[PDB]
Amino acid sequence: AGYDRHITIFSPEGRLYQVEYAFKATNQTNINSLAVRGKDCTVVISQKKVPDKLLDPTTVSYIFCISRTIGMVVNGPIPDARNAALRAKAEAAEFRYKYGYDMPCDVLAKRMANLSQIYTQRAYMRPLGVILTFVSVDEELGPSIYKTDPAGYYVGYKATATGPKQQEITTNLENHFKKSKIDHINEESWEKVVEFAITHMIDALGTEFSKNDLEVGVATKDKFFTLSAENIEERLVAIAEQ
Amino acid sequence: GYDLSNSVFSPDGRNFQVEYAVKAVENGTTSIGIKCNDGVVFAVEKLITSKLLVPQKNVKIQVVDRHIGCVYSGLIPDGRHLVNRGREEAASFKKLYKTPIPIPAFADRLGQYVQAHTLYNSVRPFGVSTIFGGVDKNGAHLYMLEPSGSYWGYKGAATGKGRQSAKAELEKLVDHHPEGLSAREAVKQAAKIIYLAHEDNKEKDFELEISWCSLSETNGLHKFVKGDLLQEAIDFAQKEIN
Amino acid sequence: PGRLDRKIEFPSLRDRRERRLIFGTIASKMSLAPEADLDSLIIRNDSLSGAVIAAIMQEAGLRAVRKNRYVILQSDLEEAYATQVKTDNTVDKFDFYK
Amino acid sequence: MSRDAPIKADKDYSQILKEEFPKIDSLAQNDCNSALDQLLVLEKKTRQASDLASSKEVLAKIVDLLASRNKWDDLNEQLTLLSKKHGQLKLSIQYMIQKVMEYLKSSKSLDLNTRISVIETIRVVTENKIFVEVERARVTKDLVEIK
Amino acid sequence: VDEKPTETYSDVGGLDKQIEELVEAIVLPMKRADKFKDMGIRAPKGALMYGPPGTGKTLLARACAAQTNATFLKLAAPQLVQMYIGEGAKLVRDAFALAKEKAPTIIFIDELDAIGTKRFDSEKSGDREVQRTMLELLNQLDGFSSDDRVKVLAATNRVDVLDPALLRSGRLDRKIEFPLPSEDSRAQILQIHSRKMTTDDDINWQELARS
Amino acid sequence: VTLDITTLTIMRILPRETDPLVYNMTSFEQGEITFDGIGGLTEQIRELREVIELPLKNPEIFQRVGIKPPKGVLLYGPPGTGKTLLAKAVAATIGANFIFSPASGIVDKYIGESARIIREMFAYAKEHEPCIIFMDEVDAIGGRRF
Amino acid sequence: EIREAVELPLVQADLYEQIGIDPPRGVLLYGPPGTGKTMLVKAVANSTK
Amino acid sequence: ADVKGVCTEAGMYALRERRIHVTQEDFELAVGKVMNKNQETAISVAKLFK
Amino acid sequence: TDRYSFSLTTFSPSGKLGQIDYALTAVKQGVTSLGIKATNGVVIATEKKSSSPLAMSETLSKVSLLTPDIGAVYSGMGPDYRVLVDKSRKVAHTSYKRIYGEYPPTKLLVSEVAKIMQEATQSGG
Amino acid sequence: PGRLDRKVEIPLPNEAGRLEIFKIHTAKVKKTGEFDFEAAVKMSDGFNGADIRNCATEAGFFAIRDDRDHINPDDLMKAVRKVAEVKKLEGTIEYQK
Numbered sequence A: 001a002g003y004d005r006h007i008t009i010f011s012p013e014g015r016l017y018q019v020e021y022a023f024k025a026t027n028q029t030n031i032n033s034l035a036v037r038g039k040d041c042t043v044v045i046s047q048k049k050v051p052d053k054l055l056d057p058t059t060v061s062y063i064f065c066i067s068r069t070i071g072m073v074v075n076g077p078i079p080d081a082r083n084a085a086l087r088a089k090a091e092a093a094e095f096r097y098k099y100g101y102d103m104p105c106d107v108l109a110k111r112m113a114n115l116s117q118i119y120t121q122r123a124y125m126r127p128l129g130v131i132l133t134f135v136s137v138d139e140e141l142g143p144s145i146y147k148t149d150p151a152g153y154y155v156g157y158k159a160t161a162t163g164p165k166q167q168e169i170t171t172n173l174e175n176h177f178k179k180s181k182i183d184h185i186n187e188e189s190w191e192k193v194v195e196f197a198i199t200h201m202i203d204a205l206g207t208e209f210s211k212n213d214l215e216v217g218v219a220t221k222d223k224f225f226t227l228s229a230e231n232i233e234e235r236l237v238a239i240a241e242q
Numbered sequence B: 001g002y003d004l005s006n007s008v009f010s011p012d013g014r015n016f017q018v019e020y021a022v023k024a025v026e027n028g029t030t031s032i033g034i035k036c037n038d039g040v041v042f043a044v045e046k047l048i049t050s051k052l053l054v055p056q057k058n059v060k061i062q063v064v065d066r067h068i069g070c071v072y073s074g075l076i077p078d079g080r081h082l083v084n085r086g087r088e089e090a091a092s093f094k095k096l097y098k099t100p101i102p103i104p105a106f107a108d109r110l111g112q113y114v115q116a117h118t119l120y121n122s123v124r125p126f127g128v129s130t131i132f133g134g135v136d137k138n139g140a141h142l143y144m145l146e147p148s149g150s151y152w153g154y155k156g157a158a159t160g161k162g163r164q165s166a167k168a169e170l171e172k173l174v175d176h177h178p179e180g181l182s183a184r185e186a187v188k189q190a191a192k193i194i195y196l197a198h199e200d201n202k203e204k205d206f207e208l209e210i211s212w213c214s215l216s217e218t219n220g221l222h223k224f225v226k227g228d229l230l231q232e233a234i235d236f237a238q239k240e241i242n
Numbered sequence C: 001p002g003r004l005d006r007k008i009e010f011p012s013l014r015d016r017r018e019r020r021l022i023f024g025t026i027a028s029k030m031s032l033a034p035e036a037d038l039d040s041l042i043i044r045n046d047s048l049s050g051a052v053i054a055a056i057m058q059e060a061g062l063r064a065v066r067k068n069r070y071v072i073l074q075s076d077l078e079e080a081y082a083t084q085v086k087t088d089n090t091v092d093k094f095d096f097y098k
Numbered sequence D: 001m002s003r004d005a006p007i008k009a010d011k012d013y014s015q016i017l018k019e020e021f022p023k024i025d026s027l028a029q030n031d032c033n034s035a036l037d038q039l040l041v042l043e044k045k046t047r048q049a050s051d052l053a054s055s056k057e058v059l060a061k062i063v064d065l066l067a068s069r070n071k072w073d074d075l076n077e078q079l080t081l082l083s084k085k086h087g088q089l090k091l092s093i094q095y096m097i098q099k100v101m102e103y104l105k106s107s108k109s110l111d112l113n114t115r116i117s118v119i120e121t122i123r124v125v126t127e128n129k130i131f132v133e134v135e136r137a138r139v140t141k142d143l144v145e146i147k
Numbered sequence E: 001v002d003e004k005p006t007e008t009y010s011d012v013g014g015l016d017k018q019i020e021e022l023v024e025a026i027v028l029p030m031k032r033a034d035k036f037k038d039m040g041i042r043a044p045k046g047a048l049m050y051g052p053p054g055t056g057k058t059l060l061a062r063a064c065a066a067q068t069n070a071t072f073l074k075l076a077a078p079q080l081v082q083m084y085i086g087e088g089a090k091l092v093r094d095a096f097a098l099a100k101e102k103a104p105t106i107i108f109i110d111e112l113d114a115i116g117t118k119r120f121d122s123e124k125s126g127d128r129e130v131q132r133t134m135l136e137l138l139n140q141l142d143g144f145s146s147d148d149r150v151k152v153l154a155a156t157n158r159v160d161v162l163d164p165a166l167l168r169s170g171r172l173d174r175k176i177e178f179p180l181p182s183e184d185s186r187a188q189i190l191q192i193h194s195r196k197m198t199t200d201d202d203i204n205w206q207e208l209a210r211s
Numbered sequence F: 001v002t003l004d005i006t007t008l009t010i011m012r013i014l015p016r017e018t019d020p021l022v023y024n025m026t027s028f029e030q031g032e033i034t035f036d037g038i039g040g041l042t043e044q045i046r047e048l049r050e051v052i053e054l055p056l057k058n059p060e061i062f063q064r065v066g067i068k069p070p071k072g073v074l075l076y077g078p079p080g081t082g083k084t085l086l087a088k089a090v091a092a093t094i095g096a097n098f099i100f101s102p103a104s105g106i107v108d109k110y111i112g113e114s115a116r117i118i119r120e121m122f123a124y125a126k127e128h129e130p131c132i133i134f135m136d137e138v139d140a141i142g143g144r145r146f
Numbered sequence G: 001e002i003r004e005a006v007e008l009p010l011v012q013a014d015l016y017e018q019i020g021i022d023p024p025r026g027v028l029l030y031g032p033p034g035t036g037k038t039m040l041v042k043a044v045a046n047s048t049k
Numbered sequence H: 001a002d003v004k005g006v007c008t009e010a011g012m013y014a015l016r017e018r019r020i021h022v023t024q025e026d027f028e029l030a031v032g033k034v035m036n037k038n039q040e041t042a043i044s045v046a047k048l049f050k
Numbered sequence I: 001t002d003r004y005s006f007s008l009t010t011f012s013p014s015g016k017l018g019q020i021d022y023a024l025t026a027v028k029q030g031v032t033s034l035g036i037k038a039t040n041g042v043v044i045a046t047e048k049k050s051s052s053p054l055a056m057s058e059t060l061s062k063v064s065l066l067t068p069d070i071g072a073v074y075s076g077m078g079p080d081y082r083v084l085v086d087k088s089r090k091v092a093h094t095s096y097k098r099i100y101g102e103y104p105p106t107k108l109l110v111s112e113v114a115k116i117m118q119e120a121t122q123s124g125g
Numbered sequence J: 001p002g003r004l005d006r007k008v009e010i011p012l013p014n015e016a017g018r019l020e021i022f023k024i025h026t027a028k029v030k031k032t033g034e035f036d037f038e039a040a041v042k043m044s045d046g047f048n049g050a051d052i053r054n055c056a057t058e059a060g061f062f063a064i065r066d067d068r069d070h071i072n073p074d075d076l077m078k079a080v081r082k083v084a085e086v087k088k089l090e091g092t093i094e095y096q097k
């Protein structure tokens, strides 16, 4: 039939082209992120762009607070970003209620993952075109980053980046942990991990940043906070004085 | 075919349906939202089709709760469904939590409803743009909602045919007043740029409707500007364009 | 047959040792830096033609003059790859069918 | 940006602090260091055009420091810091560095003092490769002559 | 030219707005060519005339170009289609060469769907023969000068069938729509035909035009 | 070489033949403008001369790199965007030998005559070198196998 | 496959004959022309001379 | 179709060898070259062309 | 609404079912796994793969546990394996550890999971 | 490629890439004194580079109507509205590598 990729049906090549089309639509906000594991923290930095002077700059955001321990960073269209932010919130209430402790990030990776499969198995549900980066600090697994993607595939990371220019970032992170020879930076405080992160991003993307063009989210132990433009301004001066 | 619906995907990141919904909103009349220090001020250009009409007897600004103004452009009947839905959702929240709904909460809700209409074969994504705001106790906020389910904070937003004239003039107003302006002083500003937005629409004649929700004039309720205050605005603008 | 017997096929696909020679012969002619590596070109796209490896290396050699520099740096070589990339979702680093 | 409030405020400050430049200038007589601090705070700008203007104030002022025979060491550290501080626009700072070297040749100083300052200055621009270079070769050959 | 008669503006019924634009677009960059230069701008290259059939697109353009005098070239767009190439395509070539001698001149193409194909992505058809007179048109409607005084009027039944290289200004810059008649306009139209034949003196032109 | 029309002997050597068509292409450049054509898209003007103007002046900087001297440009985009103006400006500014060929004035009725021009127009390009060959608004022989 | 096809009847045709294999004919090379078909013909031609 | 290309492959293998005779070992390899060819157009249903 | 309840797997005119013919090709576009059955034991072994080398591999499992006597291993799709492992376990508890209060035999577990595949062959959606 | 090694795209004129176009074209014409472009052109998008030089020509028509010899910002702000309006007649949609 001429219908063969309107629905989530295999091709002669044995493939789901429909699902592939989601991954070509995870790059429309053209924002880039990089997220690195310290020793006792996790740090995730993303670009901010406003297209006009006439928006309010605060509300423009891509780093969405899910649990009070699990941050979530979104690459791809903001309509499907929100639908992804909501579902996740729903499961976080749901886990505490029935199991009597806060949701582990690890478990949020599989639930939201299995849910993604269910959208590519119904022949009437269009998958979310958002790559989610989940950052956390767990006590049972330590600092972790889990990346889910529109297929429902996922794996763990030692560091990871996402975005259309994200190849460039992959060079910086690969070279960096090649020299350290370990999966995590030996640094005992979140401050200097924000300082490191911004440095590889300046190298990779080739442009230096400002306070109003950054957006930073930090997972510490037992709380998840986002830093404001003022706290980000402090960090930038201290890269220069290293 | 892959250019016909919403559940389809195409390898350009386009989902042609939804983009076509903006083209509906582009047939609408100009609607602006002026974000002031004390609240929000909406005005809508209302076309007078014929001299057979009964004047000032159609409201294109409909209230949701008692504190969230809502004005929409695109398909007029289609918009009336979206507002009815946000009056249900406001009423559900008012019961369950015994307070008038916050505006970032009202945002979540509506946002979800239109997003929904891009994930099923049997539905069409609504082709309307809304502009909604008011005063809640975390302060005044304003949101514009795209038919794609995209939205942002805004110190001034617009949509409609004469979104071309209106936008340039809103830049002018944040560079006039970059420390903001009063909600009283802004009645005269909404008159001025609705009148200028009828030089892309001068094949007819029109009636100006202005409404406000500001803390300092209306005690945080969504009211209409009426009587002698309303004609001072009409005169002001009328003399500048002559 | 009897006019044309043989049909010598040319595949774009090749294999992982043959992209390595073809990158490697176009690097024998030109200058490189010690920064630069040919072995970061394998993990990317796995279906190239020979003309578009003569093409990337040439385009890198223009980018090289805009820094002003006569040694090809790895900053230049990755940016050249990124233009006229002809990206695939059948190749390595772009899969989920594993 | 999202606000135009930085733009009005920044530009405006530039003109005013020309009128308060004589009050700073007398004050440098009683204590230079304190005056330095004032002009240093000024050149923290979030708006582009105003950087060009505020750097001119510092150029008149540092003439006194440069001429002195202990205080020019202190001057060489501050040039370093300026480039580092934010970047602060890449036109501004690259005009100052030159205007300083130009001033050095006209001040007149020890063969020793001349050499040592120059090494400190060629060093900052080693970690740059923008407008810097043009000047960098010119002061490098000025230094060749010395040795 | 043969010298086609003028029908002036008095065998037109309504269509005031269309005349005003037509004179503005084509006739006055010719006559006030001094003032176009004094102003510092360039003339617009031509004017598209478009809108539903029945509005006297072709009639207007003949009447007005003859009234004001400018060398009126008569070309119907289907004539550019030929099963010859290098001879059919050569009417286009010789149509600029002629026109630059007899300059200032107005090149009236009646219909512009026959060579004004939206297609340029053709699959398996003889539409790559048709488009070579579309392409050759867009070349000489570029300046390599000696075309600053050569214009284009074009009439067409529909404007949704034009090529994206005729959306652009430099080709037909001014874009005039012919509207369905208006109350005043209908009454006029009726009186212009009925002038020719004999009527009785109990006629009311408003009655017929309401109805 | 010339021949006689009744003896049929070479009397003397003649310079090469040169088609009558291609002298129009060398004598329309009009629509001229400086280095700068349309502004704010200067970054794309500077990229163009990387391929074209830079190997024209010094092939010896492409020798240091050991790459093939750059050549070959495809310009493509939305219409009206000074692709065609830029082409008149890199002919004007450098002042290197130009044609030219419209997409559809090299097309002829006679076959093996439309091969003839374009073969012989590359020939011209090797005597009058450096040369820039601007194909303008090619969609005519752009066509597929069909 | 090219050193069998082109190079072996030039160096000596008779190698075929005496084993009692009759020689292959013509070579068609097909593929996108970006694949270095053309490039291979020039490579073995410089080599066989 | 298969057996004519087994016979040809044994004499290209003896061609490489540079000996006149065809040996029994050429036919271990030859049988293996066509049977391998036959399977490489049917695992994704690929033609005899690009 | 919805009206996807019509089968999306149908017989083909030439016979055989197209959609299951497509799915099997896909298994040979995947990773490689094998199992050898010994007299006194069974082994399964497979390759671990990820997008980038900087990804972990200890947080990923392609040998998964159904019961304390029964593991599974796949070749094919990662996403599609993940869900069916969970369903394999869910049906092993609900229909055999509640009704016999122990774990099912291997033949009996096989058969249960074969029904789940089966309704992915039958019906719409 | 290698026959065609560089593939330069020139996109449509950008937000303040139109403003850079406006400044060369306001030199050509006679004007009152205009450098108050900037707001209006960014939010009257839809222009290619050639249509910038059509906002000049159509503003010299709004100028002819008034009987003026100079491009005014009163002429210019009616011109942007009109030029935009005539191109929304038909669309264009194009996508690239």
Ligand SMILES: Nc1ncnc2c1ncn2[C@@H]1O[C@H](COP(=O)(O)OP(=O)(O)OP(=O)(O)O)[C@@H](O)[C@H]1O
Pocket (backbone or CB within 6 Å): E011, E012, E013, E014, E015, E052, E053, E054, E055, E056, E057, E058, E059, E060, E155, E188, E189, E192, E193
């Ligand atoms: N304004 C008018 N005054 C009088 N009669 C009119 C007027 N306009 C049109 N008509 C009548 O309508 C006829 C049709 O006009 P014309 O052929 O010019 O139109 P068009 O819109 O280009 O249509 P088509 O090209 O399909 O024939 C005229 O010959 C005339 O009889």
Ligand SMILES: Nc1ncnc2c1ncn2[C@@H]1O[C@H](COP(=O)(O)OP(=O)(O)OP(=O)(O)O)[C@@H](O)[C@H]1O
Pocket (backbone or CB within 6 Å): E138, E142, E143, E165, E169, E170, F031, F037, F038, F039, F079, F080, F081, F082, F083, F084, F085, F137, J021, J049, J050, J053
């Ligand atoms: N950037 C510009 N600034 C000023 N005028 C321009 C600009 N670009 C084009 N034009 C004007 O538009 C006219 C025609 O455009 P041109 O023929 O150069 O373009 P193009 O992008 O190749 O498209 P086409 O080939 O369809 O014409 C020019 O002669 C010139 O007056």
Ligand SMILES: Nc1ncnc2c1ncn2[C@@H]1O[C@H](COP(=O)(O)OP(=O)(O)OP(=O)(O)O)[C@@H](O)[C@H]1O
Pocket (backbone or CB within 6 Å): C022, C025, C050, C051, C054, G032, G033, G034, G035, G036, G037, G038, G039, G040, G041, J002
């Ligand atoms: N294996 C390779 N090693 C080096 N360079 C290569 C390789 N393959 C191809 N190229 C280069 O790519 C270009 C195209 O190859 P070639 O000259 O053989 O033409 P082709 O593909 O037959 O083209 P057409 O037949 O359409 O003209 C040449 O510059 C060639 O040197």
Ligand SMILES: [Mg+2]
Pocket (backbone or CB within 6 Å): E142, F083, F084, F136, F137
């Ligand atoms: Mg052109």
Ligand SMILES: [Mg+2]
Pocket (backbone or CB within 6 Å): G033, G037, G038, G039
């Ligand atoms: Mg070839």
